């Protein structure tokens, strides 16, 4: 089984004990490490942080300690947008420019593969034709990687993609059956199901729907997402179940109603270290004092509230439950966003180093 872990190149700017660099990564924790995020310049893969070239070397240097470890570079993310992907996939010439720049870049910096994190083809401004052009891009990359492995004798570069769980996004941009044949694995983002963009509280990553949910709402859960990707043609062994080491927060319309689905007025207070209203790292929630934690019976995940703050997150128990689930479905393993959001240095939760991801490793093994 695979344990795919995302590293983020901006965590290096967090203050104090929250700062995360390649030196903070446990070489033996995961089977695959994915570096987020690379960008694109004139249809060619490019760095996004001033010191990426140096970080790339340290990152792939982890393989000197654990030779079995595989690394990949992820391109995209939310802030990257969609325009550059749309323009690049528009013509065969532009796609070749990208594909060849990707091979060179990955070989130059010693990455074992490429992870596509376009958010998303067919959505967020990307036109309908991008659903099929994304398929062409994936085919172009698979073809090129196969060819390069053959001409160079080197191990074939891996190709994966971080894909959405929401039916709306999946239908608008992914020909699942087609792309699945060309991807080595699929990183299912089985999280971000609910967030402060919604007017009521909801859990970031519920395993199942609430009994009272119906319609489209009843599909905003992990089980529905997994069933969807399998039903549309994804080989179980290629479906890697994403797990979040962070939660999503809301400010309540009233401290008197702290239920799942209670009216909310917007994002919860930004965390002291992550500083992003609407989310909190596991290490920012695991030790909340004077708070009240409760488990959502039907969804098998917890939430915690204090005064007018409400946060739905994942803990050791929910991660255990989800791995049992993925094993029961025969999935290819677990994926996690992100290394720097777990209590990596064991400074906050009194649960040792990487309490959440270590749980994934132990449960998978």
């Amino acid at each position: 089984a695979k344990l795919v872990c995302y590293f983020t190149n901006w965590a290096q700017y967090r203050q104090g004990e929250a700062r995360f660099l390649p030196k903070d990564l446990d070489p033996s924790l995961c089977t695959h490490l994915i570096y987020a995020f690379a960008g694109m310049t004139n249809h060619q893969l490019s760095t996004t942080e001033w010191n990426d070239e140096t970080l790339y070397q340290e990152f792939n240097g982890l393989k000197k300690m654990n030779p079995k470890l595989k690394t990949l570079l992820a391109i995209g993310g939310w802030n990257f947008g969609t325009q550059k992907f749309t323009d690049m996939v528009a013509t065969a010439n532009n796609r070749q420019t990208f594909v060849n720049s990707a091979i060179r870049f990955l070989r130059k910096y010693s990455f074992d593969g490429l992870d596509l994190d376009w958010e998303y083809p067919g959505s967020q401004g990307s036109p309908a034709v991008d659903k099929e052009r994304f398929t062409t891009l994936v085919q172009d990359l698979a073809n090129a990687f196969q060819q390069e492995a053959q001409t160079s004798g080197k191990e074939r570069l891996l190709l994966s993609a971080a894909v959405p769980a929401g039916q709306t996004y999946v239908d608008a941009g992914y020909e699942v059956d087609k792309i699945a044949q060309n991807l080595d694995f699929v990183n299912l983002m089985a999280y971000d199901f609910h967030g402060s963009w919604e007017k009521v509280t909801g859990h970031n990553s519920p395993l199942y729907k609430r009994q009272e949910e119906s319609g489209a709402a009843a599909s905003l859960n992990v089980d529905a997402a997994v069933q969807q990707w399998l039903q549309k043609g994804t080989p179980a062994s290629k479906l890697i179940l994403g797990m979040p080491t962070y939660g999503r927060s809301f400010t309540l319309a009233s401290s008197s109603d702290t239920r799942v689905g209670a009216p909310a007025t917007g994002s919860g207070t930004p965390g002291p270290f992550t500083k992003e209203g609407g989310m909190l790292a596991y290490y920012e929630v695991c030790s909340w004092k004077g708070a009240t934690k409760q488990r959502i019976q039907d969804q098998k995940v917890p939430y915690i509230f204090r005064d007018n703050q409400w946060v739905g997150f994942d803990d050791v128990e929910s991660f255990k439950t989800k791995v049992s689930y993925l094993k029961q479905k025969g999935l290819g393993g677990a994926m996690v966003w992100a290394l720097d959001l777990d209590d990596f240095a064991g400074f906050s939760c009194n649960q040792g180093r990487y309490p959440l991801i270590q749980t994934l490793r132990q449960e998978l093994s």
């Binding site: 939310w78 971000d192 967030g195 963009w197 994403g242 999503r248 992003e276 989310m279 966003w337 959001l341």
Partner: peptide, 5 residues
């Protein structure tokens, strides 16, 4: 937004 998105 806030994480992977």
């Amino acid at each position: 937004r806030x994480s992977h998105x």
